[PDB]
């Protein structure tokens, strides 16, 4: 069988595009308002939703996908565009909260590299036509746990060391992030991995997560400067 | 119909390759002549024409293209190689003149990111098989205007603030750049966009522009240190 | 004919994967042992064998390759994955020894860029379906010689200037590196270039070289801190 997106998925792509694009314009206003030395979280958060807006437009316009054979015998549309999005946006999301903590660049570096490895191995698993897809998935899950360790140990120490409003903002955003980001490997296991849920279900599920992880998250970042 | 390059286009690729490659060797001599602390514009300008030489060789040797369906029903050879070129060379061209101005890195950053977005969205539009090609094009045109705003407002302020020979060199190069770079979205509208002009006409038109934007421009940069 | 890997090549991929992966875990232990300010060669060497482990897994799992027409009339499986590996790992290998020398960043920059050009032009040659493959190869060989010049002239001067244990370590590693890295364009000439040796012979030959260039080399780096 050929498993591709339905109407419900395409509308979710357009809805999600609109949310990201609106957020991008808003955050551009809010950022270029602020003085040059105060723009860091602005630039980062703007870049997150701008890149996601570009990816969502692409997917809504029937780009950024390729039909890939799953070992169950179906051809499934793999939205490689989402991984390109995540390659830039997930390190940016992490930096948005890591920058609160003042930890050394050396520590931040291995957290973001654990994150890019996570995404890249997911991509490779998604483009695999065979059972070795699951080795990619499992090692990527290990790297996700490296990222979480980074957030809840050295990152957390940094935030508590700074004190003031930093711990509340950091633990609030990091706790939300940590819990939310578990949605992604779950959806992947069900979608690109096992070809169990429909591509519409996949698209809608990743869209909901992306709205939570970028729109909700981003507005929270932007509204607490 | 299948729209591909003719002989006139391939010779223009070889001619343009020769011009870039000659310029690269010359600029390598001129740069490694100069002392380590004086090499910046040298390295940048060398990199521009070296990368363009590699891209032009590739296209002359029948690489860097894929046949893509245009909604008019023709298959058109899209030279994705040129966009890979532009991804590196257009930020480098901008840096070549932005470095004259001493503006903050924060400003330079959003100018180059506006530029990379411009190129990338052009690529996506070029690889699109449907009418959403024009949304890519229009937003990319907006980003081009962001780049020009960067050059003619903060960049321009920086140059005038420095004074001396900087304003004359900056406004001369930036004015030439600004006007010349309008050629690209015009050609694209006629070529990758609408499939209106032949691929030979496309190749020749982008070649002429590239010779002006890199060979002429580069020699002007290199001959005013 | 269709030239693809046999069993001997796939086992060599798994063996090589195991060696890289073991080395990655070991080097992770050794690096996160050391204090934050002493981790540079650790991080670099860890990254080398981690990336190679990912590439070798991919190739062992039948990814990272595409069938490409050689002008001799055969279709040959080109392992583009190896070039993606080399794009990151060969600059990292160079930095691992260049960091001993204290030379200016400006010099290190053109050495690594000569190296990335070398790899990229090899990739382009490998993906070429025609005789222009050899122009890519020859220019890439020139860039290899640029890299070696970098190592044996400014890099070497830096090392001798520092003195102490640096010259012995630098010249030992650089001499080994220089000689060993000649294996790659030889194998390429025989494999991706001319389609003369089998893909199994290719895989085994690049694996042997990679084990020498990353496992042996990496253990030597890690065991001389
Ligand atoms: C910023 C840089 C370093 C990384 C971002 C670019 C990466 C993630 C991009 C660049 C080119 C992309 C690939 C180009 C072409 C295809 C063909 C299709 O059948 C499957 C997806 C696949 C294979 C893409 C996957 C994502 C990709 C690998
Ligand atoms: C330096 C990094 C971050 C960016 C530069 C690399 C980008 C622009 C390159 C990497 C791989 C490239 C893609 C790889 C394969 C194909 C297949 C072809 O049918 C259409 C072009 C397309 C899709 C290429 C377009 C350009 C591309 C996306
Ligand atoms: C870190 C960034 C800047 C560079 C690393 C990414 C580059 C080297 C990667 C990104 C996408 C890759 C390409 C994507 C798709 C294909 C299709 C296949 O038929 C031939 C290989 C080819 C064409 C790949 C070659 C390597 C590639 C170009
Ligand atoms: C048919 C479908 C079935 C496929 C099943 C495969 C699923 C595999 C799941 C993987 C579990 C995650 C493994 C990860 C286990 C932890 C590894 C680790 O070292 O990371 C933590 C530290 O680095 C922190 O410092
Ligand atoms: C059949 C072919 C017809 C297709 C027509 C589509 C062409 C669309 C053209 C686009 C016009 C350019 C829109 C750009 C308008 C300006 C947007 C903007 O905000 O940028 C300026 C500021 O950022 C500066 O600070
Ligand atoms: C059928 C197969 C036959 C194909 C033959 C093609 C092989 C071509 C081989 C290339 C030889 C290498 C050329 C390289 C020659 C040196 C060029 C150079 O300037 O580099 C050195 C300096 O930069 C150092 O500072
Ligand atoms: C700043 C610019 C960086 C943009 C990175 C966005 C990459 C997101 C999606 C890839 C879309 C591929 C779109 C490809 C369209 C071809 C079908
Ligand atoms: C065919 C129709 C099946 C429609 C299935 C629709 C499934 C929607 C799942 C969803 O929206 O989850 C959002 C959360 O992840 C937000 O946190
Ligand atoms: C320094 C090295 C960076 C080189 C970047 C040049 C990329 C330019 C053109 C892509 C050519 C693809 C050439 C692909 C040949 C395969 C047909
Ligand atoms: C088939 C033959 C049609 C040949 C069309 C040849 C069209 C050449 C256009 C050109 O060279 O423009 C150069 C400028 O952009 C430089 O600024
Ligand atoms: C840190 C993460 C960077 C990983 C870079 C490793 C790239 C190595 C090999 C490409 C494998 C492509 C694997 C593609 C699998 C699709 C068949
Ligand atoms: C079919 C069987 C042919 C098997 C050919 C096997 C050829 C193995 C060559 C090799 O392992 O070289 C290693 C060195 O490069 C290490 O420095
Ligand atoms: C805006 C997008 C976000 C926050 C995306 C996050 C994605 C992840 C946390 C993905 C994780 C994955 C794994 C842990 C294993 C398998 C592949 C995944 C990439 C989807
Ligand atoms: C050496 C190459 C140069 C200076 C190339 C410049 C290219 C541009 C200014 C391209 C601009 C584009 C748009 C404004 C919209 C549509 C896509 C374009 C990429 C060709
Ligand atoms: C761990 C991997 C290593 C050290 C790979 C090294 C690869 C090279 C030195 C490759 C060189 C090449 C040329 C000089 C010309 C033709 C293409 C090559 C890429 C294989």
PDB file of C-alpha atoms in Angstrom, chain B residues 14 32 39 43 50 54 57-63, chain C residues 106-107 110 121 124 128 130 132-136 143:
ATOM      1  CA  UNK B  14      33.184  26.736 -19.725  1.00  0.00           C
ATOM      2  CA  UNK B  32      49.336  35.031   0.009  1.00  0.00           C
ATOM      3  CA  UNK B  39      44.314  39.016   4.172  1.00  0.00           C
ATOM      4  CA  UNK B  43      40.500  35.242   1.586  1.00  0.00           C
ATOM      5  CA  UNK B  50      36.954  29.422  -6.124  1.00  0.00           C
ATOM      6  CA  UNK B  54      33.819  24.598  -8.717  1.00  0.00           C
ATOM      7  CA  UNK B  57      32.973  23.227 -13.689  1.00  0.00           C
ATOM      8  CA  UNK B  58      30.237  20.952 -12.276  1.00  0.00           C
ATOM      9  CA  UNK B  59      27.511  22.457 -14.467  1.00  0.00           C
ATOM     10  CA  UNK B  60      29.846  22.440 -17.532  1.00  0.00           C
ATOM     11  CA  UNK B  61      30.522  18.748 -16.833  1.00  0.00           C
ATOM     12  CA  UNK B  62      26.713  17.988 -16.768  1.00  0.00           C
ATOM     13  CA  UNK B  63      26.417  17.741 -12.958  1.00  0.00           C
TER      14      UNK B  63
ATOM     15  CA  UNK C 106      44.096  32.089   9.730  1.00  0.00           C
ATOM     16  CA  UNK C 107      46.574  29.374   8.727  1.00  0.00           C
ATOM     17  CA  UNK C 110      42.994  27.492   4.904  1.00  0.00           C
ATOM     18  CA  UNK C 121      35.656  17.303  -5.040  1.00  0.00           C
ATOM     19  CA  UNK C 124      31.567  15.168  -6.938  1.00  0.00           C
ATOM     20  CA  UNK C 128      29.928  12.014 -11.888  1.00  0.00           C
ATOM     21  CA  UNK C 130      31.433  10.871 -17.201  1.00  0.00           C
ATOM     22  CA  UNK C 132      35.149  14.921 -15.981  1.00  0.00           C
ATOM     23  CA  UNK C 133      35.386  12.718 -12.840  1.00  0.00           C
ATOM     24  CA  UNK C 134      39.186  12.970 -13.421  1.00  0.00           C
ATOM     25  CA  UNK C 135      39.276  16.828 -13.297  1.00  0.00           C
ATOM     26  CA  UNK C 136      37.608  16.576  -9.863  1.00  0.00           C
ATOM     27  CA  UNK C 143      44.227  20.302  -2.420  1.00  0.00           C
TER      28      UNK C 143
END
